[PDB]
Design a protein around this ligand. Structure first.
Ligand SMILES: CN1C[C@H](Nc2nc3cc[nH]c3c(=O)n2C)C[C@H](c2ccc3c(c2)OCCO3)C1
Length: 108
């Protein structure tokens, strides 16, 4: 059901982008913020790029969307010190989006 999938993912992404802990993840990391980021992190991802992917019908499966969303968090934990504001935000956003993924029937 492509339309159900699209609208469900759209509605989910809108909620994730509204959460207060989303702020580090809304747009791509700039080289001025982290100069080696694009050498260290080889599949960079952020919520603006996820919005572009959604709208261009990249997310033809639920799993492709979930992979990208989970990678926002994984990249943060790989790049940054484990005790850091960015990792705190990542953990808070993750907690929220797992509540929302469960609410939406997108994971068990
Ligand atoms: C686009 N860019 C992404 C940055 N994202 C980011 N930068 C770094 C640097 C080292 N590591 C990481 C990392 O993992 N991420 C995700 C966050 C940065 C930002 C800075 C200050 C803010 C803010 C956003 O929004 C509200 C107010 O102040 C914006």
């Amino acid at each position: 059901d492509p339309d159900q999938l699209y609208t469900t993912l759209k509605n989910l992404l809108a909620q994730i982008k509204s959460h207060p802990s989303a702020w580090p993840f809304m747009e791509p990391v700039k080289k001025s913020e982290a100069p080696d980021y694009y050498e260290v992190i080889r599949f960079p991802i952020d919520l603006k790029t996820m919005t572009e992917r959604l709208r261009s019908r990249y997310y033809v499966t639920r799993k492709l969307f979930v992979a990208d969303l989970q990678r926002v968090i994984a990249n943060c934990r790989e790049y940054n010190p484990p005790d850091s504001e960015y990792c705190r935000c990542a953990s808070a956003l993750e907690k929220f989006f797992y509540f929302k993924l469960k609410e939406g029937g997108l994971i068990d």
